[PDB]
Motif scaffolding. Structure first.
Motif, PDB file in Angstrom:
ATOM      1  N   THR B  38       0.793  -1.242  -0.096  1.00 15.99           N
ATOM      2  CA  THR B  38      -0.145  -0.091  -0.093  1.00 15.99           C
ATOM      3  C   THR B  38       0.951   1.142   0.058  1.00 15.99           C
ATOM      4  N   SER B  39       2.153   1.232   0.254  1.00 14.57           N
ATOM      5  CA  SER B  39       3.222   2.323   0.161  1.00 14.57           C
ATOM      6  C   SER B  39       3.860   2.132  -1.030  1.00 14.57           C
ATOM      7  N   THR B  40       3.226   2.944  -2.034  1.00 17.39           N
ATOM      8  CA  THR B  40       3.850   3.326  -3.433  1.00 17.39           C
ATOM      9  C   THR B  40       4.785   4.812  -3.345  1.00 17.39           C
ATOM     10  N   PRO B  41       5.837   4.698  -3.005  1.00 15.67           N
ATOM     11  CA  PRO B  41       6.615   6.128  -2.669  1.00 15.67           C
ATOM     12  C   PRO B  41       6.920   6.859  -3.951  1.00 15.67           C
ATOM     13  N   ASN B  42       7.510   7.913  -4.071  1.00 16.92           N
ATOM     14  CA  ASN B  42       7.951   8.957  -5.163  1.00 16.92           C
ATOM     15  C   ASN B  42       9.332   8.842  -5.038  1.00 16.92           C
ATOM     16  N   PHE B  43       9.909   8.337  -6.130  1.00 15.41           N
ATOM     17  CA  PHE B  43      11.348   8.078  -6.233  1.00 15.41           C
ATOM     18  C   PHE B  43      12.105   8.889  -6.974  1.00 15.41           C
ATOM     19  N   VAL B  44      13.319   9.087  -6.919  1.00 12.82           N
ATOM     20  CA  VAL B  44      14.242  10.014  -7.548  1.00 12.82           C
ATOM     21  C   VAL B  44      15.477   9.179  -8.052  1.00 12.82           C
ATOM     22  N   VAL B  45      15.553   9.098  -9.418  1.00 12.34           N
ATOM     23  CA  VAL B  45      16.835   8.408  -9.980  1.00 12.34           C
ATOM     24  C   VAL B  45      17.789   9.337 -10.391  1.00 12.34           C
ATOM     25  N   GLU B  46      19.278   9.182 -10.075  1.00 14.30           N
ATOM     26  CA  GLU B  46      20.230  10.274 -10.124  1.00 14.30           C
ATOM     27  C   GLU B  46      21.389   9.253 -10.943  1.00 14.30           C
ATOM     28  N   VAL B  47      21.419   9.582 -11.946  1.00 19.33           N
ATOM     29  CA  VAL B  47      22.652   9.036 -12.830  1.00 19.33           C
ATOM     30  C   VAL B  47      23.773   9.787 -13.312  1.00 19.33           C
ATOM     31  N   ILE B  48      24.981   9.127 -12.698  1.00 21.31           N
ATOM     32  CA  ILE B  48      26.301   9.823 -12.968  1.00 21.31           C
ATOM     33  C   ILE B  48      27.031   8.781 -13.718  1.00 21.31           C
ATOM     34  N   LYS B  49      27.817   9.332 -14.814  1.00 24.23           N
ATOM     35  CA  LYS B  49      28.433   8.534 -15.633  1.00 24.23           C
ATOM     36  C   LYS B  49      29.812   8.746 -15.222  1.00 24.23           C
ATOM     37  N   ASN B  50      30.837   7.705 -15.684  1.00 25.41           N
ATOM     38  CA  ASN B  50      32.187   7.549 -15.133  1.00 25.41           C
ATOM     39  C   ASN B  50      32.957   8.683 -15.531  1.00 25.41           C
ATOM     40  N   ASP B  51      32.928   8.979 -17.075  1.00 22.81           N
ATOM     41  CA  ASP B  51      33.208  10.190 -17.841  1.00 22.81           C
ATOM     42  C   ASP B  51      33.380  11.373 -17.180  1.00 22.81           C
ATOM     43  N   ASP B  52      32.385  11.911 -16.890  1.00 18.66           N
ATOM     44  CA  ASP B  52      32.369  12.969 -16.059  1.00 18.66           C
ATOM     45  C   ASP B  52      31.484  12.829 -14.560  1.00 18.66           C
ATOM     46  N   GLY B  53      32.007  13.057 -13.386  1.00 17.29           N
ATOM     47  CA  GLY B  53      31.407  13.008 -12.264  1.00 17.29           C
ATOM     48  C   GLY B  53      30.816  14.328 -11.805  1.00 17.29           C
ATOM     49  N   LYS B  54      30.912  15.462 -12.786  1.00 17.73           N
ATOM     50  CA  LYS B  54      30.480  16.792 -12.527  1.00 17.73           C
ATOM     51  C   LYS B  54      28.952  16.797 -12.472  1.00 17.73           C
ATOM     52  N   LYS B  55      28.426  16.341 -13.542  1.00 14.18           N
ATOM     53  CA  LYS B  55      26.661  16.539 -13.600  1.00 14.18           C
ATOM     54  C   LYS B  55      26.258  15.088 -13.561  1.00 14.18           C
ATOM     55  N   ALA B  56      24.805  15.206 -13.077  1.00 12.80           N
ATOM     56  CA  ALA B  56      23.929  13.862 -13.036  1.00 12.80           C
ATOM     57  C   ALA B  56      22.715  14.254 -13.541  1.00 12.80           C
ATOM     58  N   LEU B  57      22.093  13.328 -14.309  1.00 11.16           N
ATOM     59  CA  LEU B  57      20.786  13.355 -14.890  1.00 11.16           C
ATOM     60  C   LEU B  57      19.758  12.930 -13.665  1.00 11.16           C
ATOM     61  N   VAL B  58      18.859  13.811 -13.297  1.00 10.48           N
ATOM     62  CA  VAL B  58      18.061  13.413 -12.254  1.00 10.48           C
ATOM     63  C   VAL B  58      16.548  13.348 -12.690  1.00 10.48           C
ATOM     64  N   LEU B  59      16.141  12.128 -12.597  1.00  9.97           N
ATOM     65  CA  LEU B  59      14.820  11.758 -12.980  1.00  9.97           C
ATOM     66  C   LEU B  59      13.676  11.599 -12.139  1.00  9.97           C
ATOM     67  N   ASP B  60      12.689  12.451 -11.797  1.00  4.70           N
ATOM     68  CA  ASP B  60      11.856  12.409 -10.632  1.00  4.70           C
ATOM     69  C   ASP B  60      10.743  11.437 -11.038  1.00  4.70           C
ATOM     70  N   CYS B  61      10.400  10.419 -10.493  1.00  7.53           N
ATOM     71  CA  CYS B  61       9.430   9.406 -10.986  1.00  7.53           C
ATOM     72  C   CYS B  61       8.343   9.295  -9.787  1.00  7.53           C
ATOM     73  N   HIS B  62       7.238   8.555 -10.189  1.00  5.55           N
ATOM     74  CA  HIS B  62       6.318   8.438  -9.179  1.00  5.55           C
ATOM     75  C   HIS B  62       5.149   7.226  -9.993  1.00  5.55           C
ATOM     76  N   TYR B  63       4.255   6.878  -8.964  1.00  7.04           N
ATOM     77  CA  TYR B  63       3.582   5.771  -9.306  1.00  7.04           C
ATOM     78  C   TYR B  63       2.152   6.377  -9.712  1.00  7.04           C
ATOM     79  N   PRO B  64       1.667   6.245 -10.794  1.00  5.90           N
ATOM     80  CA  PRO B  64       0.240   6.935 -11.216  1.00  5.90           C
ATOM     81  C   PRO B  64      -0.736   6.401 -10.432  1.00  5.90           C
ATOM     82  N   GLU B  65      -2.202   6.910 -10.712  1.00  2.00           N
ATOM     83  CA  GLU B  65      -3.375   6.391 -10.103  1.00  2.00           C
ATOM     84  C   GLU B  65      -4.513   6.230 -11.126  1.00  2.00           C
TER      85      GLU B  65
END
Lengths: 141, 148, 133
Positions: B38-65
């Motif tokens: 019953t606990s469907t949280p909202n999660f955030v995916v952070e992707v950091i590539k080896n090539d450059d540790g300076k920036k990360a792609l941030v993907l804000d996810c959630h469970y729809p209704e």
């Protein structure tokens, strides 16, 4: 390419999606801040008088929906964090007129509000195009 | 008792109500952050590539209704409202799908989403039980009877 | 002159945020509320022995504990609807032993109203003074 200019003498400083407009030659420190993510944006006018540099009048402005182009939504003082904030719906027309005139004397008028929409739209588009490129560069294998 | 396992070799760490799942996928570091409360949280995916540790792609996810989860918005972050954030409603279906595939290649897929619901529910029950203990311990002065 | 709170409570106001502090028998009790739109008040209890019990209270007994949590001097917060009546009553009593009772709740309404009209009047003056030419 080149972003639209704001009339009345203003210096634009960009910091990501946050733009600051500072009145170039003034007797006071007038700063207009807006954010391309938060195109009719919401802008905050900060006024610091010469007489006292300790506090600043903060006027939170916005563009209404269906004559003035913008509205002061709320007013407060900030030191140069929690402060007393008055919503302008609780103000009489005479004090709202004084506030709007106070902004006009500092160049925050209808022309400025129309020009801010054009500048904001341009900044939005520029950031949007760059984001898609960066996204392609990152996700495309 | 023992928390449910996440498929894919994810390493869990909990700091208060904030849980982080970490896994390495070809030098790229993938972090999934979510909160308990019953606990469907909202999660955030952070992707950091080896090539450059300076920036990360941030993907804000959630469970729809059909996909179990959705990407609500996407942005870049340095490893701070000054970062451009795109809402996914303004994306064409092919780019949205591409982003979904990009997440699945890094293990953030439907199975992961379903497993995250199970792990989240478990972490919630665990923190709840611990909280009641700590609460009762803090107000132990209020007991009428004393076991001697 | 602002109305007094019974119990020997030290008041401090930082903007719109008012704090009432009373040093009990080796426990510090702080009640925080906001003077800008019957307020919602937060009770923080720190024992002599590192963490503090935080009780979020509101006016629906004159007041109710809406939710409870611990804070160090992202924390798990329990809503009191999930508590059994007996433990909720122990929490209410625990507050009352520390001066947070019905009298305190009634008095806080009076103090809150006074602080509101005081800050409002001062703000308009300062505003008109700043905007006048």
């Amino acid at each position: 390419k080149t972003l639209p200019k704001m009339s009345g003498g203003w210096e634009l400083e960009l910091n990501g999606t946050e733009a600051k407009l500072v009145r170039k030659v003034a007797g006071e420190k007038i700063t207009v801040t807006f954010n391309i993510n938060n195109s009719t944006p919401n802008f905050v006018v900060e006024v610091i008088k010469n007489d006292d540099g300790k506090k600043a009048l903060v006027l939170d402005c916005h563009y209404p929906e269906d004559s003035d182009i913008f509205s002061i939504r709320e007013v407060s003082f900030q030191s140069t964090d929690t402060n007393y904030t008055l919503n302008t719906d609780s103000l009489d027309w005479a004090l709202y007129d004084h506030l709007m005139d106070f902004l006009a004397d500092r160049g925050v008028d209808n022309t400025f509000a129309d020009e801010l929409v054009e500048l904001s739209t341009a900044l939005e588009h520029q950031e949007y195009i760059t984001f898609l490129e960066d996204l392609k560069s990152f996700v495309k294998s």
